[PDB]
Design a protein around this nucleic acid. Structure first.
Ligand SMILES: Nc1ncnc2c1ncn2[C@@H]1O[C@H](COP(=O)(O)OP(=O)(O)OP(=O)(O)O)[C@@H](O)[C@H]1O
Ligand SMILES: Nc1ncnc2c1ncn2[C@@H]1O[C@H](COP(=O)(O)OP(=O)(O)O)[C@@H](O)[C@H]1O
Ligand SMILES: [Mg+2]
Ligand SMILES: [Mg+2]
Ligand SMILES: [Zn+2]
Ligand SMILES: [Zn+2]
Ligand SMILES: [Zn+2]
Lengths: 426, 212, 461, 664
DNA sequence: AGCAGATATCACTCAGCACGA
DNA sequence: TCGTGCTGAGTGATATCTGCTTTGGGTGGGTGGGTGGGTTGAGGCAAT
């Protein structure tokens, strides 16, 4: 009844929106379908402009309204692509005020919120159920279930005599999707007085997976929901859209993501006869002098080229710089600026560091009783720069662990039955 | 100032002392269970003070009837029969804390003195329970002389507890069975001590008043 | 509807209770003296009107439960009566000092308040009887009201060492102060009220434990049969406490005076039956042998020896070794068939073997017992249902006082009381209810047997 | 007249006619009377000044969009003794009625406040009786208690169901919502309609959630008997109370002592023993506030509007800075150079972030290098008392990770976790390190990053994180050999290295010299102070008046008012520099560098120019001024130049003082 | 598979009356 | 006042069906506990 009307309203919004003479979402959906990208990104300002009632309905009960929007998108896609296709995904963009991660409480339960933080951990992709094929043990009755991933579903308790829970899933006829778990910490500047940073559990589906790497600031739009692991519920965030300032896709792939307008801006800048002076002046504008150190930092950021010989020998292509000087030289400020400007960077204190901190650590899983390897500053800062302040303060033991990382750009671990050679190109 | 509505009957406690004989922890036997005797030992550990249910009061779920003065054994106890002729409720009760009575409770762990210990032997240990005013009268490390009654403590787990799933000697410690409660289970016993007396062997105007 | 009306009833009675009066904390004298409210007499009259128009005419008992909930009795009526009695005692002392000296104002109003308080006390303390025709509300509130009555009796016997008994005695003596011919029906009604108050105070006792029988009893079974309130023990309501209070407040003297001048200076029609009921409730649970027996140590030693002999006889059935020793016996029947028994006593003895064989059997033949609840007929607990040997444990002083009281009554007015009761009852035999028949017969039997025993013990009486 | 709407009077309310306090309070008429009396108390209560305290409190509550009205227990006790007794004996229902009557006094001022916060909580501030976790017994059950302890363990904030809705498995009927106790679970056994033994699936169309948190309160080391194991209790923090107490802090907890049935407890002990908890009503941060226990209120550093007006009036005075300096440690005779530095450190500077790329520290560090008996530890103790957040540490008593942050394995989750330290606890506060020179090298070196970057970096056991440490450090040290040698340079008198010395903004060298006049004056002042503090030398009002009279002798400003003033200035004032003599500061810096070129001299770097600017900002802040004036800059220049001159040797001190006479 | 709780359908005891002795 | 059924509904009782849960291991959790078991390896910390 009402669901059909909501779906019709969403379909009309998709098929009728236009700001000048291009149907933005219709054309976007067609283009996405062309390249086998079953999704659609919707700007919430446009939804508010088209009809405020639709936005009110979406905001009131997101977990119950979003699936209807996905169904409408799927129907419109079928109309536009097939001449008489899994369920499409809805990705939202908004400009609402960002709520501090610590300000999330009971008042924000089951609502769309926007917040920013730092990703500290990502999980291995799991498998969720969308279309389940089931059969009854006794009478062998074939049945199907369609499941949406939004949680306010189970196998029928009663067959359609058969005992409780008589249905068994047939796997070869079912369809699954991808799922991932992320841990989001709060920005250091936003932490309250004398408090440890807070962690938040988050989940992403399908096309929002494999979008972020640990240690990168991101902005998240999602639903502040709760799940029962007796009078309490564990909070979590259902991601609806990820916005980051670092092109992670272009970093972990040889593929490079840059708009044509970008590529041509970076060529024009490179054509500048004196780009070297511009970049030298662009580093630590608030620090006087130290021109040579600024040039060295520019060279370190740019880095060299790495060659792999036919015999297998590999030549390093990263540049390391040491600053030994008197107090008040502004070395720490330069290190902080380098950490801020580099696409990937980790700022660490020698004093407050360890051998296992800076390479990788053997960690036992509490449940499985199995040993895994976590990563340290030189694995988290792979492909970037590691700013080791207070280098002199570092213990010998700790220090000695850095040699292979610096030169061979690898980490060798032989502990608790784990024999592996990690990659640390920093 | 005002009338106090809560004035319950006093819970008198009788404390004995000056027993002719003082026993050691190694001298405790099962023939003296339920007898008044004194023991001496060194306090090892002291638990915190807890409220212990003494005389419970319950209200009927159905008809709101009230059942009072339900004596409690080592386990939690509830009524079985509603006092209302009309009411059929048997096994549906809710505890009422307002009308219930609680007592102070503390667990003290003691071990035999070093001089009494046979050479090259592990010290022997015993559990002493203090109630009422005798609470927090023994501190760890002290050498105390307790006077009280030797008791035997069952396995309350076996007996059946609300919301609790039930469950040296190489399996030779087999308990007693045959009880209705213990349909297929067995009951084991533990020797403890209930002490009623504790003796620890080991501004101008206020001061003047104290002196004789 | 019903629940809302119950809430309104409770609220209105609570307002009445708060409006009756309370202690005056302004005065520095401690303990504070009770102060009467502006409309104390009106409040008592309204409470009596509520009792008449709701409790009885509508066949319910919600008013009594509401009154008990807000402690109207233990906090208002008993202090009022005690204070009035103390004022009268002070006036008597002043008169002794100087007969013309007086320290009373509004004496009529105080007497009116005291009389209304005594009437309400009798109303609240009247025996509770459940019949077959009793409404559902009456049936459902039986146990709670009995518990409240127990609390009332304990408070009456304890507070101020029971001075309300002295207040009632003074009220009765006020009627006694006027001649028999000058005695108006109101005075006789007051006398009957006082006697009924005493009878009710003696009569009250714990009720029965009523259990629904719809369903066969569970695997858990009966836990305990306890009807006592939370903060009331059997020591507070026992006949020992009643004897102590009566001796302290000289109730026995008043009763003896009434029963000695019976049918001579009084109208017997009003007084004969209340006296008979009072004495029956006095002596219904008392065995006469106990009254004619440190000696406690000697008896304790004898009982310990008896238990020792019983334990010695029990010992032959116990095995010296532990249970798991595991001795197996085979016993041969007259025909060549062997039966198996377990236990050392089985091997060492044959009678024990056959007893164990018998005992081991699982099948039981059904035994049906015809049990009649005494509360069904409205009778109180007495010798008829009390288990044989149930002994009322008196203290030495209380036992002496009770024996002296009974002896004085038997030597003073038992003859006249029996004659008057027999005349009145044979004149009105058919109207007898079961309670009156049982009461008369038990009183006659008890007193005759006690006199027989005392005559045997003592050659004088 | 409807009987349910009739009400009694106060004297009649005192007379109890029920079997228990809860039954008396729950009665309709009694509840109405209690609510009316509480409303009257809130509306009509007046202090010595004569203005409605709670009217202003409600105004402030509405202004700040808060949901907690603080009520002082003493005020209620004096105004309405019976209501205070009821609150003490039956906290639950009394607090419910008090909460209701508070949203009708708030709503009186702000009619539409219900659209901001649905409910308002009442918090009791000063309960007369204080208990220890050892002293708790069964007689305190279901009654308000006040206990102190250490927050050993903490949980994350969880949403808890305010109301629980049940539906029959079989029948399908949905039972009405039920109140969720904070203590233990609510279950339905007997169905009103269905009458089914079977359980109910728990479902609800719409549920209202509540903030929930639990902490492990432990006896503080100070209060526990020496050498005995501490006792602990579990404290439950409901909505608006969460995150107020942080692990490792010392707090006073006002709450309800409650007990519940625990099966495992019974099982383990073998006796019918009930578990116990505390339902927090109010929390007071006792950390570093041992000497401030004589005040009232949940927060002694908070201020009212009238106190803000008084602060403004005080600030408008010309000689405010001199009075503030004189009020620092009034019991210490002289050392007007150690008091000025302490005041500057307490007020602090303004941190700056230029274009989001450059971060500049805005805190002032002070070091006291002096003789054994020159009143340094007492100064540190006074700073600890006055500062809003302070931490005290000793030389060898402090480890390299006891300061800063440390890594442990979590007992519950069996995973590596991060703990705070001295520095962390002193965020936006002060860290005091007595016996600085006796510190281990390793220990000492720890604070290097923290003292300038205002951040802590940890890379241990797979934990890669950066914390915030915006704490100022004031340290006391003894010169090498136990006594300063004024002939040798400063560097030879101490074992500290150049970086640590440079990180200190102000250096105060204290010398003990024999002088007849100085000795006479110091002895006279010490004797007078000792006589003044002799214990023998309304009742509460009389005590306060005599204390004020004693204080007036040695301090021009009340100490509590001084702490409130410092907190207000730090929180609400951020001075800026717009007009200033560039050439003067540049020349001063150049001259300082030229004179410091000498070997063994006190190090000079850009850090000290920034310290001059910071001290100017602090001096401007001392007057609650929004802009730094030329006088403040001149005073800061004089302070720094005087410290530098005093740090020199005897032989060249005269020449240095003559050269720098222009600036000072 | 075994165990504990429960439903419901299975008999048996005291109850009492008609005939005659 | 014995003997022999016929009536009988009450008061049982015992022969008979309806729902957990378990082992131990994270394919039940950490608002069931760590004194009911698991448990050897790595890691960080303080006293040394
Ligand atoms: N040339 C400069 N321009 C601007 N600011 C400077 C310059 N030199 C030093 N500073 C300031 O001096 C202070 C020195 O602190 P910083 O932590 O940067 O020093 P550092 O060289 O790392 O020394 P250390 O070895 O003592 O840690 C910083 O506030 C920095 O802003
Ligand atoms: N200038 C002073 N004014 C008042 N009292 C002082 C002064 N200097 C020292 N004292 C007294 O002498 C003692 C000095 O001890 P303390 O300062 O704690 O030692 P340290 O200086 O090594 O920390 C204090 O108790 C203090 O009362
Ligand atoms: Mg540095
Ligand atoms: Mg010192
Ligand atoms: Zn089926
Ligand atoms: Zn019932
Ligand atoms: Zn139902």
């Amino acid at each position: 009844d009402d669901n059909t009307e909501i779906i019709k309203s969403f379909k009309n919004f998709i098929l009728e929106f236009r700001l000048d003479s291009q149907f933005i979402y219709r054309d976007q959906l067609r283009n996405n379908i062309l390249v086998k990208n079953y999704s659609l990104t919707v700007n919430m300002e446009h939804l508010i402009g088209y009809n405020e009632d639709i936005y009110k309905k979406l905001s009131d009960e997101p977990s119950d309204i979003i699936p209807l929007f996905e169904t409408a998108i799927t129907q419109v896609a079928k109309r536009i692509s097939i001449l008489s296709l899994p369920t499409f995904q809805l990705i939202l963009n908004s400009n609402a005020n960002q709520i501090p991660l610590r300000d999330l409480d009971s008042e924000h339960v089951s609502k769309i919120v926007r917040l920013s933080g730092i990703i500290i951990s990502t999980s291995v992709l799991s498998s969720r159920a969308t279309y389940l094929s089931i059969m009854c043990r006794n009478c062998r009755h074939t049945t199907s279930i369609t499941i949406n991933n939004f949680n306010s579903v189970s196998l029928p308790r009663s067959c359609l005599n058969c005992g409780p829970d008589p249905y068994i899933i047939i796997h070869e006829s079912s369809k699954f999707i991808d799922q991932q778990f992320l841990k989001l910490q709060e920005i250091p500047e936003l932490v309250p007085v004398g408090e440890m940073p807070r962690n938040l559990t988050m989940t992403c589906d399908r096309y929002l997976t494999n979008k972020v790497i640990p240690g990168t600031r991101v902005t998240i739009v999602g639903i502040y929901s709760i799940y029962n692991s007796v009078a309490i519920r564990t909070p979590y965030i259902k991601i609806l859209g990820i916005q980051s300032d670092v092109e992670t896709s272009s970093i972990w792939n040889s593929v490079t993501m840059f708009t044509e307008e970008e590529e041509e801006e970076f060529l024009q800048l490179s054509r500048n006869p004196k780009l070297y002076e511009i970049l030298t002046n662009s580093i630590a504008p608030s620090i006087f002098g130290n021109e040579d150190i600024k040039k060295a930092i520019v060279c370190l950021l740019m880095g060299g080229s790495k060659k792999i010989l036919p015999d297998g020998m590999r030549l390093r292509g990263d540049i390391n710089v040491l600053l030994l000087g008197d107090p008040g030289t502004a070395k720490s400020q330069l290190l902080k600026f380098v950490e801020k400007v580099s696409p990937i960077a980790v700022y660490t204190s020698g004093k407050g560091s360890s051998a296992a901190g800076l390479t990788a650590s053997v960690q036992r899983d509490p449940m499985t009783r199995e040993f895994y390897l976590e990563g340290g500053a030189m694995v988290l800062a792979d492909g970037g720069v590691v700013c080791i302040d207070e280098f002199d303060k570092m213990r010998d033991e700790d220090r000695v662990a850095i040699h292979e990382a610096m030169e061979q750009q690898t980490i060798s671990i032989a502990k608790a039955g784990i024999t592996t050679v990690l990659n640390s190109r920093t | 100032t005002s009338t106090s509505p809560e004035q319950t009957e006093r819970v008198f406690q009788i404390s004995f002392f000056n027993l002719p004989t003082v026993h050691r922890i190694r001298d405790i036997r099962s023939e003296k269970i339920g007898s008044l005797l004194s023991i001496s030992g060194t306090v090892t550990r002291t638990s915190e003070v807890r409220p212990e249910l003494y005389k419970a009061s319950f209200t009927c779920d159905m008809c709101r009837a009230i059942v009072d003065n339900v004596e409690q054994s080592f386990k939690y106890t509830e009524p079985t029969f509603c006092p209302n002729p009309s009411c059929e409720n048997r096994a549906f009760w809710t505890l009422n804390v307002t009308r219930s009575r609680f007592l102070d409770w503390q667990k003290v762990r003691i071990q035999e003195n070093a001089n009494e210990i046979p050479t090259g032997s592990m010290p022997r240990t015993l559990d002493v329970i203090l109630r009422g005013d005798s609470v927090e009268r023994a501190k760890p490390g002290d050498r105390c002389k307790f006077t009280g009654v030797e008791i035997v403590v069952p396995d309350v787990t076996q007996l059946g507890l609300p919301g609790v799933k039930p469950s040296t000697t190489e399996g030779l410690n087999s308990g007693v069975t045959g009880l209705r409660s213990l349909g297929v289970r067995d009951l084991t016993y533990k020797i403890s001590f209930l002490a009623c007396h504790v003796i620890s062997i080991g501004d101008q105007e206020v001061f003047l008043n104290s002196l004789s | 509807a019903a629940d809302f009306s119950l809430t309104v009833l409770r609220a209105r009675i609570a307002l009445l209770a708060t409006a009756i009066g309370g202690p005056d904390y302004t005065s520095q004298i401690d303990p504070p003296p009770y102060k009467l409210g502006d409309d104390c007499l009106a409040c008592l009259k309204d409470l009596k009107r509520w009792f008449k128009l709701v409790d009885d005419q509508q066949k319910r008992w919600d008013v009594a439960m509401a009154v008990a909930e807000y402690r109207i009795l233990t906090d208002d009526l008993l202090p009022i009566l005690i204070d009035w009695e103390n004022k009268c005692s002070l006036a008597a002392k002043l008169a002794k000092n100087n007969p013309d000296h007086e320290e009373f104002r509004n004496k009529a109003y105080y007497d009116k308040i005291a009389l209304n308080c005594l009437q309400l006390l009798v109303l609240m303390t009247w025996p509770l009887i459940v019949t077959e025709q009793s409404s559902s509300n009456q049936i459902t509130l039986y146990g709670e009201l009995k518990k409240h009555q127990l609390v009332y009796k304990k408070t009456i016997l304890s507070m101020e060492s029971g001075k309300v008994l002295r207040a009632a005695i003074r009220l009765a003596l006020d009627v006694i102060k006027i001649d028999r011919l000058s005695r108006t029906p109101r005075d006789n009604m007051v006398l009957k009220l006082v006697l009924n108050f005493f009878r009710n105070v003696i009569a009250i006792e714990p009720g029965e434990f009523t259990i629904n029988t719809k369903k066969s009893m569970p695997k858990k079974g009966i836990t305990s049969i306890d009807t006592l309130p939370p903060n009331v023990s059997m020591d507070d309501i026992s006949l020992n406490t009643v004897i102590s209070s009566f001796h302290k407040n000289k109730v026995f003297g008043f009763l003896l005076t009434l029963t000695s001048s019976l049918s001579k200076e009084f109208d017997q029609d009003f007084i004969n039956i209340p006296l008979l009921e009072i004495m029956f409730y006095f002596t219904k649970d008392v065995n006469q042998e106990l009254l004619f027996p440190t000696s406690a140590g000697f008896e304790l030693s004898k009982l310990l020896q008896k238990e020792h002999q019983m334990r010695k006889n029990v010992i032959k059935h116990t095995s010296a070794r532990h249970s798991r020793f595991g001795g197996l016996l085979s016993i041969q029947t007259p025909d060549k068939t062997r039966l198996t028994v377990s236990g050392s006593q089985a091997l060492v003895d044959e009678k024990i073997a056959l007893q164990k064989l018998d005992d081991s059997k699982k099948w039981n033949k059904r035994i049906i017992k015809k049990h009649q609840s005494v509360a069904a007929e409205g009778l109180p607990n007495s010798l008829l249902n009390s288990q044989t040997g149930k002994a009322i444990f008196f203290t030495e002083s209380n036992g002496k006082h009770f024996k002296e009281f009974i002896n004085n009554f038997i030597d003073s007015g038992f003859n006249i009381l029996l004659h008057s009761v027999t005349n009145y009852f044979t004149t009105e035999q058919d109207r007898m209810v079961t309670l009156e028949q049982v009461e008369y017969l038990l009183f006659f039997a008890w007193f005759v047997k006690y006199q027989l025993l005392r005559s045997k013990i003592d050659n004088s009486a | 007249i409807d009987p349910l709407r009739e009400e009694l009077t106060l004297e009649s309310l005192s007379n109890v006619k029920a079997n228990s306090y809860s039954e008396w309070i729950t009665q309709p008429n009694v509840s109405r009377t209690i609510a009316r009396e509480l409303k009257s108390f809130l509306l009509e209560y007046t202090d010595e000044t004569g203005r409605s305290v709670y009217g202003a409190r409600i105004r402030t509550l509405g202004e700040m969009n808060s949901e907690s009205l603080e009520v002082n227990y003493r005020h209620l006790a004096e105004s309405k003794a019976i209501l205070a007794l009821f609150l003490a004996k039956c906290p639950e229902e009394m607090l419910k009625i008090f909460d209701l009557v508070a949203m009708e006094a708030t709503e009186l001022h702000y009619p539409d406040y219900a659209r901001i916060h649905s409910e308002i909580h009442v918090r009791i501030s000063d309960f007369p009786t204080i208990y220890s976790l050892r002293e708790l017994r069964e007689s305190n059950l279901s009654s308000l208690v006040r206990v102190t302890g250490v927050v050993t363990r903490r949980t994350g904030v969880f949403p808890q169901l305010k109301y629980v809705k049940f539906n029959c498995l079989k029948c399908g009927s949905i039972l009405g919502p039920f109140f969720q106790d904070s203590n233990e679970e609510i279950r339905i056994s007997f169905c009103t309609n269905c009458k089914s033994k079977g359980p109910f699936r728990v479902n609800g169309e719409k549920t209202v959630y509540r903030n929930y948190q639990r902490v492990t309160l432990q006896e503080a080391p100070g209060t526990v008997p020496p050498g005995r194991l501490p006792r602990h209790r579990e404290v439950i923090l409901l909505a608006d109370l969460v995150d107020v107490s942080k692990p490792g802090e010392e707090v006073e907890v006002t709450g309800i002592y409650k007990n519940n049935y625990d099966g495992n407890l019974n099982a383990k002990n073998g006796f019918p023993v009930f578990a116990t908890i505390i339902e927090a009503n109010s929390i007071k941060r006792r950390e570093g506030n041992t000497a401030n226990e004589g005040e009232e209120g949940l927060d002694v550093f908070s201020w009212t509007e009238e106190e803000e007006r008084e602060f403004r009036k005080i600030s408008r005075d010309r000689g405010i800075i001199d009075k503030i300096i004189s009020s620092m440690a009034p019991s210490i005779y002289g050392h007007r150079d150690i008091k000025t530095a302490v005041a500057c450190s307490l007020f602090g500077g303004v941190p700056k972030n230029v274009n989001g790329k450059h971060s500049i520290r805005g805190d002032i560090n002070v070091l006291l290098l002096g003789d054994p008996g020159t009143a340094k530890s007492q100064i540190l103790k006074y700073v600890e008392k006055t500062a809003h957040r302070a931490v005290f540490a000793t030389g060898q008593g402090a480890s390299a990770v006891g300061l800063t942050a440390s890594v442990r394995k979590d007992p519950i989750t069996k995973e590596w976790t991060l703990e705070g330290g001295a520095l962390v606890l002193a965020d936006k506060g002060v860290c005091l390190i007595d016996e600085f020179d006796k510190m281990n090298d390793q220990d000492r070196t720890s604070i290097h990053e923290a003292m300038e970057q205002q951040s802590i970096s940890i890379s241990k056991a797979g934990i890669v994180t950066t914390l915030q440490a915006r704490c100022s450090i004031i340290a006391a040290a003894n010169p090498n050999g136990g006594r300063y040698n004024s002939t040798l340079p400063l560097a030879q008198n101490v074992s500290l290295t150049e970086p640590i010395l440079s990180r200190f903004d102000i250096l105060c060298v204290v010398r003990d010299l024999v002088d007849e006049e100085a000795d006479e004056r110091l002895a006279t002042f010490v004797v007078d102070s000792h006589v003044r503090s002799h214990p023998e030398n309304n009742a509460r009002q009389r005590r306060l008046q005599r204390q004020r009279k004693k204080e007036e002798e040695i301090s021009p400003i009340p100490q509590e008012l001084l702490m409130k003033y410092i907190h207000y200035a730090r929180t609400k004032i951020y001075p800026k520099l717009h007009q200033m003599d560039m050439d003067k500061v540049s020349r001063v810096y150049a001259d300082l560098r030229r004179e410091s070129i000498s070997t063994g001299s006190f190090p000079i770097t850009v850090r000290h120019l920034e310290s001059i600017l910071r001290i100017a900002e602090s001096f401007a802040k001392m007057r609650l001024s929004e802009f730094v004036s030329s006088y403040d800059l001149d005073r800061a220049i004089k302070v720094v130049v005087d410290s530098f001159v005093d740090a020199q040797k005897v032989s060249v001190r005269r020449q240095l003082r003559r050269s720098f006479a222009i600036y000072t």
